[PDB]
Amino acid sequence: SMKAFVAGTMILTATGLVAIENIKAGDKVIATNPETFEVAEKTVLETYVRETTELLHLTIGGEVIKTTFDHPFYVKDVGFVEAGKLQVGDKLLDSRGNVLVVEEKKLEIADKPVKVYNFKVDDFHTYHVGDNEVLVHN
């Protein structure tokens, strides 16, 4: 159960977007509280990086988000689930808490171990990924 994203994966900030490869400790991101959908800015405590050959591709609302097979995503009226256990046409949420839909699920083995990034948040335990701002867990 690795929990990471590939390089170039976009992250929602107070000023716009950043790549996950460029988040640092003491940088801020938007975090939408899964208790009450309160939208807040929160800071980063640590920034982890791993390597893996096993990747998963998901399309949400026309945005591709390449991730790990065990990565936690939030589902409408259900809660958090592993990215590799989702189906097409199932209901995710965004940074406002509005409903998104899965367009595609895809898998491959990479020809070399790819670098993948993850981080932990100061009080909240969520953040947002891709140009469509999809809700995910720490």
Side-chain angles (χ1 to χ4, degrees), residues 6 63 69 90 100 122-123 127:
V6 304
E63 177 71 340
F69 192 87
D90 211 353
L100 283 172
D122 164 82
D123 180 84
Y127 58 95

Side-chain angles (χ1 to χ4, degrees), residues 79-112:
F80 49 74
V81 66
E82 294 81 78
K85 303 183 190 173
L86 286 172
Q87 330 75 236
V88 180
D90 211 353
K91 284 75 170 301
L92 298 177
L93 295 189
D94 96 322
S95 79
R96 289 177 171 186
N98 295 321
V99 186
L100 283 172
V101 188
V102 181
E103 296 286 288
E104 190 175 28
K105 182 152 178 279
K106 267 275 173 54
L107 193 79
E108 87 184 81
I109 307 306
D111 195 72
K112 61 179 181 177

Side-chain angles (χ1 to χ4, degrees), residues 16-49:
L17 288 173
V18 75
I20 196 170
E21 69 184 291
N22 296 320
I23 297 275
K24 305 191 295 190
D27 282 346
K28 290 184 176 181
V29 296
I30 310 302
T32 296
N33 195 340
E35 177 168 281
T36 195
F37 297 96
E38 176 160 280
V39 187
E41 290 157 51
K42 291 275 73 68
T43 201
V44 172
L45 310 176
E46 284 183 86
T47 51
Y48 284 97
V49 189

